[PDB]
Amino acid sequence: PEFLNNTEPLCNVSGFAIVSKDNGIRIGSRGHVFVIREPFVACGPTECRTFFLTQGALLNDKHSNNTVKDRSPYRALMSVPLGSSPNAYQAKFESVAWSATACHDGKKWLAVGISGADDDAYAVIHYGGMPTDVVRSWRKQILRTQESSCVCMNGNCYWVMTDGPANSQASYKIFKSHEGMVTNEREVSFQGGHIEECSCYPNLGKVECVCRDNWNGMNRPILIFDEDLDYEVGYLCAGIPTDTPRVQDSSFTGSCTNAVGGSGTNNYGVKGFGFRQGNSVWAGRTVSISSRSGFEILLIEDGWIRTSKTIVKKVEVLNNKNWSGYSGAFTIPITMTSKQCLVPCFWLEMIRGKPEERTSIWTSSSSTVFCGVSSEVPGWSWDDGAILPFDIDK
Amino acid sequence: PEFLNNTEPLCNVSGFAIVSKDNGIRIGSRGHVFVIREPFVACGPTECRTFFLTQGALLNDKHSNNTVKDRSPYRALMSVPLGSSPNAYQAKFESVAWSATACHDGKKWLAVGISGADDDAYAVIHYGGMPTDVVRSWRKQILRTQESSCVCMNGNCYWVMTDGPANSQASYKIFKSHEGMVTNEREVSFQGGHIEECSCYPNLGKVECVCRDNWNGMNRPILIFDEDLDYEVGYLCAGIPTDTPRVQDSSFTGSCTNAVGGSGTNNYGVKGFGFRQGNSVWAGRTVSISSRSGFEILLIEDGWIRTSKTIVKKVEVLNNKNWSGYSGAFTIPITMTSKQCLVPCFWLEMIRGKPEERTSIWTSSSSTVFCGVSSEVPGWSWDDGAILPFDIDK
Amino acid sequence: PEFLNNTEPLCNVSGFAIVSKDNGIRIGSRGHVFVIREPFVACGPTECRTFFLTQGALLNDKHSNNTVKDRSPYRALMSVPLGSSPNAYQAKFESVAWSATACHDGKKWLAVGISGADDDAYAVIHYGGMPTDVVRSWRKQILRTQESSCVCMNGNCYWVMTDGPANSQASYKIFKSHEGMVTNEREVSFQGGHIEECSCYPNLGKVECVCRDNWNGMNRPILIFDEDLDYEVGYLCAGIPTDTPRVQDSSFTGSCTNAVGGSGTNNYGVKGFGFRQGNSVWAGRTVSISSRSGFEILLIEDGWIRTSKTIVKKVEVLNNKNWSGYSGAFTIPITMTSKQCLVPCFWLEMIRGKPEERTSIWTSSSSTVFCGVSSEVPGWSWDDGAILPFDIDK
Amino acid sequence: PEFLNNTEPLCNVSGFAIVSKDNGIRIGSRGHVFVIREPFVACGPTECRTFFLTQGALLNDKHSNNTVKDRSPYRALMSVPLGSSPNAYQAKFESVAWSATACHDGKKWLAVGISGADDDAYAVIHYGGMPTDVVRSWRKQILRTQESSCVCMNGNCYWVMTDGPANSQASYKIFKSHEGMVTNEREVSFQGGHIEECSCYPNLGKVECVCRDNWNGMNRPILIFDEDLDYEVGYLCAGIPTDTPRVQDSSFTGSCTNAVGGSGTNNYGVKGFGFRQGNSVWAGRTVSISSRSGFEILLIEDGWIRTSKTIVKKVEVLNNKNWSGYSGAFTIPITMTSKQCLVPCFWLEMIRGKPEERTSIWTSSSSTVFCGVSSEVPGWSWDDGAILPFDIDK
Ligand SMILES: *[C@@H]1O[C@H](CO)[C@@H](O[C@@H]2O[C@H](CO)[C@@H](O[C@@H]3O[C@H](CO)[C@@H](O)[C@H](O)[C@@H]3O)[C@H](O)[C@H]2NC(C)=O)[C@H](O)[C@H]1NC(C)=O
Ligand SMILES: *[C@@H]1O[C@H](CO)[C@@H](O[C@@H]2O[C@H](CO)[C@@H](O[C@@H]3O[C@H](CO)[C@@H](O)[C@H](O)[C@@H]3O)[C@H](O)[C@H]2NC(C)=O)[C@H](O)[C@H]1NC(C)=O
Ligand SMILES: *[C@@H]1O[C@H](CO)[C@@H](O[C@@H]2O[C@H](CO)[C@@H](O[C@@H]3O[C@H](CO)[C@@H](O)[C@H](O)[C@@H]3O)[C@H](O)[C@H]2NC(C)=O)[C@H](O)[C@H]1NC(C)=O
Ligand SMILES: *[C@@H]1O[C@H](CO)[C@@H](O[C@@H]2O[C@H](CO)[C@@H](O[C@@H]3O[C@H](CO)[C@@H](O)[C@H](O)[C@@H]3O)[C@H](O)[C@H]2NC(C)=O)[C@H](O)[C@H]1NC(C)=O
Ligand SMILES: *[C@@H]1O[C@H](CO)[C@@H](O[C@@H]2O[C@H](CO)[C@@H](O)[C@H](O)[C@H]2NC(C)=O)[C@H](O)[C@H]1NC(C)=O
Ligand SMILES: *[C@@H]1O[C@H](CO)[C@@H](O[C@@H]2O[C@H](CO)[C@@H](O)[C@H](O)[C@H]2NC(C)=O)[C@H](O)[C@H]1NC(C)=O
Ligand SMILES: *[C@@H]1O[C@H](CO)[C@@H](O[C@@H]2O[C@H](CO)[C@@H](O)[C@H](O)[C@H]2NC(C)=O)[C@H](O)[C@H]1NC(C)=O
Ligand SMILES: *[C@@H]1O[C@H](CO)[C@@H](O[C@@H]2O[C@H](CO)[C@@H](O)[C@H](O)[C@H]2NC(C)=O)[C@H](O)[C@H]1NC(C)=O
Ligand SMILES: [Ca+2]
Ligand SMILES: [Ca+2]
Ligand SMILES: [Ca+2]
Numbered sequence A, B, C, D: 001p002e003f004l005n006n007t008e009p010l011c012n013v014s015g016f017a018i019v020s021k022d023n024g025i026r027i028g029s030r031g032h033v034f035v036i037r038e039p040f041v042a043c044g045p046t047e048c049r050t051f052f053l054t055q056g057a058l059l060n061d062k063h064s065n066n067t068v069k070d071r072s073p074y075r076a077l078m079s080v081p082l083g084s085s086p087n088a089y090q091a092k093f094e095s096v097a098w099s100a101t102a103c104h105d106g107k108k109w110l111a112v113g114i115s116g117a118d119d120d121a122y123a124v125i126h127y128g129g130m131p132t133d134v135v136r137s138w139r140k141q142i143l144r145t146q147e148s149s150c151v152c153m154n155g156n157c158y159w160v161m162t163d164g165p166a167n168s169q170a171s172y173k174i175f176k177s178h179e180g181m182v183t184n185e186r187e188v189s190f191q192g193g194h195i196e197e198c199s200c201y202p203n204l205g206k207v208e209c210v211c212r213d214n215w216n217g218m219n220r221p222i223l224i225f226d227e228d229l230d231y232e233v234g235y236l237c238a239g240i241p242t243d244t245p246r247v248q249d250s251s252f253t254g255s256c257t258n259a260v261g262g263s264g265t266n267n268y269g270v271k272g273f274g275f276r277q278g279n280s281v282w283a284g285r286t287v288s289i290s291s292r293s294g295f296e297i298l299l300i301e302d303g304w305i306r307t308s309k310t311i312v313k314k315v316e317v318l319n320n321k322n323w324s325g326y327s328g329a330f331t332i333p334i335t336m337t338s339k340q341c342l343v344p345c346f347w348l349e350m351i352r353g354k355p356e357e358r359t360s361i362w363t364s365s366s367s368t369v370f371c372g373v374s375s376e377v378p379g380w381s382w383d384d385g386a387i388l389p390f391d392i393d394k
């Protein structure tokens, strides 16, 4: 076993093909399936896995009642093989966690899970299934992290954390680790900017992140850093906003440097992703400008470097009649593909139950997962598919 | 790990012995078992697996209600070890798919799954669990494939696809792949012929396929091709028809070149199989000429090369009082047997529920699987065995 | 991987220690557990497994209703790790079978499963999970076999089969196989004797079997054979009868050569076992002389060579207030123990439901398993423990 | 594969970080999860597992009714990966057992399980899944052992057993084994002392144990021994009592040599643990002095060598409003960490149902697990979380 280099360029792709769909909520109507959030994906050399957070409650059971806060002592990070339902008997325990990130360095799985009180939380780092290190809250205000795959290159793994207010200036840090030990960290200076729930991927030996601004921006922050934790921080240049909530494209003017907001979009957002394509960018977004419904991905010409409004490709993978949710980025290593570049992939969360479906007492989600390919690929609408309400709701 | 040669001659066999029976529907009366179709089998060097399509709904659950079209966004290809029930906790996710084929090249599993809209479907090729390539619909009319094992020889894997009308001239293509990448393709010219749901196997380094004509033929198309995708196409010569629906043997005259139909048999069929035995052929068929009930296999003397009506052996594996369904071919590699030839095997699908059993709201199937042996083997009737209706039907 | 020699002498043991108890029926009150019979055990170099026959029906499900004959098309042989419940999600499919034997040769698992009609049954031999050979019924009268572990030595595996009447002279054969291919067979001449359900084990390079006489004997047949299938056949010499039904010890006179019966004991029996200990013998039996209740094992001084009534040790592992059933022999290879001899072990089946418990609609069994050790070990009563009737019975 | 040295010094740690939480009872509201006690943890070179005792009954099933004594013929030791629920389909059978210990020597798992009658119990030693040896009761009075991990060093594994009265002078023995064979034993002379349920760990090539006195001591016995089974025995010196029941700290005077009790604390206790830290000690205890509620761990300055009352650190991991239970020690080997010392960890059992919650008919527990780290870590309260009563209780 060797460490994965993962220093290759990201592939240029012309479309995204569906790779998996877990159908977890449909299955959980009768099967024993966890109520979950954030079904993020991470890949090792020979295996991709779906990670997820759960309260340790099953679908159609009384413990799924939404009577416990998100950041509870029951919240755990688990994983299953990509495409599997998040069920009670295939699930692998990863970490205690109400916020998490995970990735694979070529030799072992790394899992970072945050638990504890809001004013004194801490991350426990798990490497090869063993607890190896901890990161304490430095602002004592809900230490939190990506809710998607971290990035490993040359045996070092990297991730982004936030500590501080949800709707005003907070503190943002980048971490470097080796075999589960934190070996370096750096605070990112970003006055007037806000970073949450970063979706990060490797690209030519640097980590590129597209994040969520939960303060003044309906455009997404971009954070790029290297092995020294030297960084560049700003906003996705594109004159097309990709957070939710946002305004219609024609009412938006882009910025590479500043959060662009207002018009009722401040103080919220959703986790999302983007992939640099030379000077251009593939960016995901909900179809609705106001709600977490539908999902589409746009190729914006020169969108990484200027305030372009030129959309050269657009693919819809979930229509606006269906609930979406978080989305995140990951990559497939060279060690399984016949390529000399890293394949960009994303997962899409489709939330069912509360808050949008109030006749249910619970909230869960299922996923679809897509990977970039060298040719154009048609879209469709791969919705969750569960028929609500469920037995427990009656 | 090395690629499987698979260039040996197909074994001559004198009988078929039962290898497995999954009892999936019986088990699913209480256990957590998917509602499925097409439980096809494919074998690697050391392992055979049952693949299947599911809507992501379990037996005895409301989601099994037949209220969704076959080609849905929920449809997925999964697999379990041969003989296992298609259950929620042993199942391995293979591909999003409402049509599929899968096989093993000696090193890794290949899975080809088609999804998307009828007018713009696409196959996603999965190799070693990673998405590697795509094949787009070229006629924009329900791109579709074998619903049984593909064939790998010398590290190349091959399969047959169809695109176009169900009941008139369509378009048929053969594909060649290496490590999940399409490396060659060829359109098969077959004017007046119709090819669906090919059952293919390796024989002396060529791929031999016995298919379904859903147009003018109650005889089965035969397609034989080599590594260059050079091909021969026609019909099973035998003066014994083996599709369903068909007419009684005495009312049928065979043809090597032309579809033979009429007499109320046009515009339908069922997936089935045959195995060349030198100049002769083993061919499966339902016992009933009109319905998918019962199953028997016939050895027809010189049936591969002339319009013979000489049946030298016949074995029944399911009596006509019981529902059958699709059947398909596969082979067992040399790397597990003590033979210098490839062992011919078939699977039999036994459909329960709709359309034949209208007091049930669902449709599923279970399987029996048989392999050829060097001596004669008695038949019997190994039926599905589930007691309908089920709880959910009341 | 290499073939297991298994030519060592059987260990002399002074007691039997409990190794496992599956609690399958207790678990199956709520869990998804097969209704089973004959939970026999077989061991490879690094692993012991419990094999079992099932109708493919689960406990507490309607399909467990005793409305199907034992020799049905649904009957299958499966296995789980030793000590595991025979459940729907850990079970490994082995063979279609209403009668079976299985063992491990050091490299792969061998499973022999009989199915088909009573007048034309056949065994399918599975090796490493692949069908390799068949054995046809030669008397056309319920071909049947051990219902316990077969024996492998030096890469050859051996088992005993019977074909013919249940309660009069039948035909008995020994089989030799290599890598799943039958390489030799021999009919055992035993006029006036009856052999069923042999419990066999290796001892100094020969196979020693203790069987069931279902005709005129309340004493157990002994069959000993070598690699050439040369054999000795007779009855356990001991003046202590060990079949059920039988008479009280004081009413019995032993014989090395002849079936001893009468007194209402003819035409029935139960599968059981014994282990040669030099000139002596460990023999199991039900505590009751008439019913399958309780279980004890007796060390009979010189019981292998003369009509001894000297019982030097006796251990009870199930009291007479509890239902027993079949019992069988197996051995643990040197490759896991620190011994130069083969450790003798037995499994005990504890039957619940019909016929003894008529308020239940089903019949299943669970197991306890014991291995011989160099010192005396106290007994106890490890009963099945399920509380009947079950939900489905109401 | 090689034997684990495990002769390194125990790490000095400044805090304990949460590693896992199984949420078993919450999951078992709907999933198939055993009713358990003593979810102890043991680690091999590459894997930690949760072991547990069960009656072979599932949560929410009638067999979970508390109508069977603890020491029953149904009681079994099983294991799952650390963090997994003790469920019916992931569980691995380890031993028949109503008392147990288990550990890993670097090559294989060792499991020691005691069963049989109170007046003639015996331990069966399982090594690599094979029965290898037995230990008989020597006082014929409920032979019993640690209910936590044993200790392996240089290929030898060690554990402590007790035989005799629960509330007066009993007999205590230390055992040494190699590959599942008992190779040495020693009776520990401890007149006026009482040893039960030892929590043991390796430290610089010796075994250090912190136990439970169920007689005259509210302080915990300490037993330290080496490879020769030479030993030192006494009591934890600290002037802080850590058993339950106990008196308030200010009412307690420590002793290194004598049991300190009275004041209504005699004749009971709870399994607990401590870790030597040079001259100091980390010791766990319930928050309540009288009941098994809450849990905290204290670093007592010089607490290993003198009657110190100086508490330098205290961390609470479960508040006093929540039920606790047994706790035990284990260590993480060097072969997974980047350390030159053995990491001290503990598990905490949280009991639900009887006796404290009398509206339930059953008793089970779930666990949280913590490992020592080089920095201080905040506490919190990670409670079981199940909502009682359950369906079966109505
Ligand atoms: C999920 O949690 C909700 C909120 O706790 C539960 O809803 C509430 O359940 C309680 C208990 O049944 C209800 O209280 C009862 O009302 C009846 C009718 O008058 C009365 O007889 C009882 O004395 C009690 O007051 C309450 O009405 C109900 N709804 C609320 C609070 O909005 C719900 O039961 C939980 N669901 C599950 C599956 O656990
Ligand atoms: C499977 O799908 C079928 C078709 O949707 C379902 O059958 C239909 O179920 C609905 C809802 O219960 C029925 O409608 C109701 O009839 C009652 C009686 O008058 C009326 O009070 C309601 O207002 C409503 O109209 C309908 O009759 C029934 N049958 C049909 C449409 O043929 C079925 O419920 C589904 N099964 C499962 C398990 O989901
Ligand atoms: C297991 O199999 C047995 C035998 O088939 C089943 O018992 C029988 O069940 C049938 C159907 O419920 C009963 O027939 C009915 O009796 C009622 C009462 O008069 C009548 O209204 C119906 O027309 C019908 O005749 C029968 O009495 C009953 N007992 C027998 C045959 O001895 C049983 O239901 C099966 N259990 C399960 C769980 O499947
Ligand atoms: C768990 O075990 C307890 C103790 O055995 C069970 O409680 C007892 O259950 C029995 C049987 O239902 C009860 O006896 C009955 O009382 C009714 C009412 O008068 C009477 O008609 C019957 O003739 C019988 O005497 C008993 O009252 C009840 N409670 C006790 C003994 O304290 C309980 O059923 C078990 N729970 C489960 C889920 O198995
Ligand atoms: C993805 O496309 C980009 C843009 O075309 C490629 O980047 C160019 O690469 C060429 C050759 O090295 C350079 O001359 C250009 O300056 C690059 N342009 C930009 C904007 O960076 C890139 O090579 C492609 N990546 C892959 C893996 O094919
Ligand atoms: C299966 O049987 C066929 C037919 O007998 C065998 O094919 C013959 O092989 C011989 C020897 O090579 C040739 O002389 C004949 O011309 C062949 N006949 C035909 C019709 O092809 C074939 O060898 C057998 N296959 C196996 C694996 O034994
Ligand atoms: C089991 O016990 C038997 C009986 O004592 C042993 O067999 C004897 O072995 C010695 C030494 O080879 C011979 O001299 C005797 O003739 C044997 N007696 C009989 C009746 O066979 C046997 O060695 C023991 N087996 C083991 C593995 O220890
Ligand atoms: C844990 O801390 C103890 C106490 O400080 C360390 O033990 C000391 O080690 C030094 C260096 O060998 C000795 O000079 C002292 O005599 C020791 N003190 C005692 C009380 O034993 C110990 O080294 C530390 N362990 C680890 C693994 O770092
Ligand atoms: Ca925002
Ligand atoms: Ca047709
Ligand atoms: Ca008899």
Ligand SMILES: [Ca+2]
Pocket: D212, D213, D214, D215, D216, D217, D218, D219, D243, D244, D245, D265, D266, D267, D268, D269, D270
């Ligand atoms: Ca005490």
